[PDB]
Design a binder for this molecule. Sequence first.
Ligand SMILES: Nc1ncnc2c1ncn2[C@@H]1O[C@H](COP(=O)(O)OP(=O)(O)O)[C@@H](O)[C@H]1O
Ligand SMILES: Nc1ncnc2c1ncn2[C@@H]1O[C@H](COP(=O)(O)OP(=O)(O)O)[C@@H](O)[C@H]1O
Ligand SMILES: C[S@](=O)(CC[C@H](N)C(=O)O)=NP(=O)(O)O
Ligand SMILES: C[S@](=O)(CC[C@H](N)C(=O)O)=NP(=O)(O)O
Ligand SMILES: [Mg+2]
Ligand SMILES: [Mg+2]
Ligand SMILES: [Mn+2]
Ligand SMILES: [Mn+2]
Ligand SMILES: [Mn+2]
Ligand SMILES: [Mn+2]
Lengths: 489, 490
Amino acid sequence: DFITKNNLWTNEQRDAADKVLAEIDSLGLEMIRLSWADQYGLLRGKSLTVASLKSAFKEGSEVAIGPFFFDLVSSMVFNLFTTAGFEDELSGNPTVVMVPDPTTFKVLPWADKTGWMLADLHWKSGEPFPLCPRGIMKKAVKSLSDEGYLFKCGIELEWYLTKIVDRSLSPESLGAPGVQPDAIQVQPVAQGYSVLLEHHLDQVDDIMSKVRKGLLELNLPLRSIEDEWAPSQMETTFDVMEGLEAADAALLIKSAIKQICSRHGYHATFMCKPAINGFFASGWHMHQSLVDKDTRKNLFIPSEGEVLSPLGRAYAGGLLANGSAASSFTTPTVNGYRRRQPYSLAPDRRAWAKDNKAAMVRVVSATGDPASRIENRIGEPGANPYLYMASQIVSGLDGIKNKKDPGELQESPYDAQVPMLPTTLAEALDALEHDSELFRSCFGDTFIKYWLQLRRSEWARFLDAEGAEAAEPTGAVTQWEQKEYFNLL
Amino acid sequence: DFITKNNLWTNEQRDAADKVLAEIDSLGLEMIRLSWADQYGLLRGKSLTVASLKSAFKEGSEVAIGPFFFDLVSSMVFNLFTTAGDFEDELSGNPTVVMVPDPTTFKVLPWADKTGWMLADLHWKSGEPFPLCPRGIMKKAVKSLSDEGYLFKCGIELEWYLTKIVDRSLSPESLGAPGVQPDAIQVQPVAQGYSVLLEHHLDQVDDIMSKVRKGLLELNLPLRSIEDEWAPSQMETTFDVMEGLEAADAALLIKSAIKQICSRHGYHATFMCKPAINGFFASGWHMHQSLVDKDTRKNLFIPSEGEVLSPLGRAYAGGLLANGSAASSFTTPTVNGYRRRQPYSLAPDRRAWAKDNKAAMVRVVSATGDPASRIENRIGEPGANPYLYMASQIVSGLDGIKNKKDPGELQESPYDAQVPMLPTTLAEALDALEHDSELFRSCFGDTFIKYWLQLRRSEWARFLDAEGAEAAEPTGAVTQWEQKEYFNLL
Ligand SMILES: Nc1ncnc2c1ncn2[C@@H]1O[C@H](COP(=O)(O)OP(=O)(O)O)[C@@H](O)[C@H]1O
Ligand SMILES: Nc1ncnc2c1ncn2[C@@H]1O[C@H](COP(=O)(O)OP(=O)(O)O)[C@@H](O)[C@H]1O
Ligand SMILES: C[S@](=O)(CC[C@H](N)C(=O)O)=NP(=O)(O)O
Ligand SMILES: C[S@](=O)(CC[C@H](N)C(=O)O)=NP(=O)(O)O
Ligand SMILES: [Mg+2]
Ligand SMILES: [Mg+2]
Ligand SMILES: [Mn+2]
Ligand SMILES: [Mn+2]
Ligand SMILES: [Mn+2]
Ligand SMILES: [Mn+2]
């Protein structure tokens, strides 16, 4: 019993495991997917039979770390054939153990008799695997809990709904290791640039009603479905969730949207800005408040003369001060930097403002209002949820602990004289490299080295394919971006 | 609790909220839409889950005012990125407002999956009403009329086009851009025409029209008649008398339901006045209106033996006529609607009233002692914003009542009357409003009028740059700009 021997499950987790096995027998489920987010936030793993899952509830399930050493097209960035003497060399294909987390169990409503659960990656020694994004989120959550606070997050996701025309499965379109396969061919499902039009919601509801039902059956706190600005651009928002549960929920939300749509011949994409005429950039704005661990009261609520409590003001200051170093985490994709431009309802600057969607940090609050909170509009829909939320926790807590000041609330953020944000992924990586202390301390030195190496390899690929001129945010979306992100994100 | 704090719900509304939640639970609904009319009369908003709606019955639901600062194709007319120090003076920024649900408007949408529907009033986070909300302008008109002791009674008679969709124009090359018109939906007529009121036409189109009929009846809208209008595929739907804000709400829902049901079955219903399709003649929205007593609920327009209307109704008509040019942009808000401002079209080109003559702006339908006695204002277009159209009527008529204005002589031949001509272009309607702005600045609000003038002139400049002055003349052919501006959404 690997799990008990290394005391990897709390009592809550073990009892949850008992009730999960009961639900599996009662429903007659036949498969249970055991998955974990990779560096890109994509779910990787295996589907197990009932017997194999009950065995994994004791021994775990051995898996290889290959995904971490691959980019999205399986370029070998770190050599996988040499057993290392690991955290210093980042080489080899060592085996890790998927340790199931029973509290995350779900029945997938769109699949045949299939359940679903996340796993934490552990060395066979029993120590956590240092590249696991979920582990990084757990570390951030624990540091926040050590400071006496809980992270409350409202998930607000923009994405694109399209109808599949060709799945690009012909042999000649499959690429190779390090060679992008062809993008799926699609057709928009509705005109746009008539924001929040009810008729648009009705027009697409033959499929969106299935997405809605799937989310509701997964017991996710769906809050709203909305027609976004662009043609076929949708928005789904969720009620407030807390910490690790919130990150897991975002992961499942994106997975479920994509799988339901594909099951009915649609392609949902969280690629920031697809290379399709008429498609405007999508954003992932992170609504966030801190509550007291004990009182469970929103500690961002302002007084009469304030936009935020002094605690929320310092949290905003930390968000702004670290927004450049954290850019590669909030906006991991090269195509996410298409949003780094003015007059776009997306931030190009490290500025905060009250109820102004031109700013990076938008304060939504009223005196005494427990909904008072920060909206960070820097994120992209394809961000790894664990890294996005952990970067937010780390930045805000750095602001609180070092009592950093956000400065003046900016009326007219796009004319503000504040430090500019990175305009390319390379700039974001540069910003992290030269200001790495906070994230090396909180995310881990080994992880930051691995991250820098991998993301720079991807940037070199993009630059080799398209050239430097293309990186310009206002430029047209390149085919490299489409063939890197459209299918999988 | 935003709603209770600012005393935004009456007791009737709170009771309705309780029953709305009970019906939602009993029917097992999963989504409830919260919608509101924008400046154009188009429903904007969100679809909420049950839990989120239950929260919105206490705190409301935040939204941005973006729609008000966009035109139909999302040209940014007002800077949305500089927050204003004084919003009503600068009209800039993207401030947040609160959708406050109105539980008395709740409906189950019969054509959708487990979906309810409700209107919301936009309120500042301070708790004050949002000054550009069309429903608020109507609420203000209903209040001013009630203060004088009268109730607005309106019979909705909308004309519209029913076509079958051939191509939804969803190819990426057809989607447009911010401020750039997308391609019009391609359609096909459903029946020949120029055989007015033919029963066989009604039967021919009834495979879908029966669905529209059932949808309207299940929404408890007081449908009165379905009729074959003159042109090929031109329909008419009329409704029994409704009152004030409820009448405006009903018109809005009526148009929304017609369009959604038709689209659900592969048809396109359009309230664009005159589509750029060969053979399609202009559609009209004639507003039938009477005033009743707030207490006796008896028609105060009913004439005596030697009169076509009571003195109140004759003074109400005078107010309509005197202010008909200033109100033109409200009754006839689209460029395309001014294709009706021509002299032998059963549509008005002049500020004249007449008894039972459909050539005049104001047609009096009455008989001595007949509670059906009323005024028909034939100036409106089907694509009008119901709130602004009905409110313009209330405002003009009450102005006529208070100034005891004389409608003048009933015109036997309204198209030969030597009376002021009505504006022939949207630009002219805006000029007329600007030069005669007192009444509508006072009753609709000064900020709303400044905003309206700026927005509509920006749209007119777009049309003029795209088609030229030669095109504006009413009898000219309908331009591609008009089709691509109005066909899909109106
Ligand atoms: N105290 C809070 N802390 C964090 N998020 C919150 C809080 N209260 C509400 N939210 C969240 O804020 C989000 C609002 O989404 P949305 O209505 O799209 O905002 P906007 O469109 O103005 O950015 C929801 O995800 C909701 O869960
Ligand atoms: N007292 C009244 N006040 C306002 N409208 C009325 C009154 N009595 C009847 N109506 C309305 O008059 C309209 C008649 O429509 P219709 O017969 O199509 O008009 P038309 O005579 O122009 O063809 C209906 O909408 C009906 O509700
Ligand atoms: C209306 S928008 O500002 C659109 C944002 C844009 N798609 C972007 O962030 O790139 N999102 P929201 O109003 O929900 O906060
Ligand atoms: C037969 S008609 O006179 C023609 C109306 C025309 N479509 C118009 O443009 O106003 N309308 P209605 O019967 O409702 O009075
Ligand atoms: Mg939003
Ligand atoms: Mg009629
Ligand atoms: Mn949005
Ligand atoms: Mn947002
Ligand atoms: Mn007619
Ligand atoms: Mn009529």
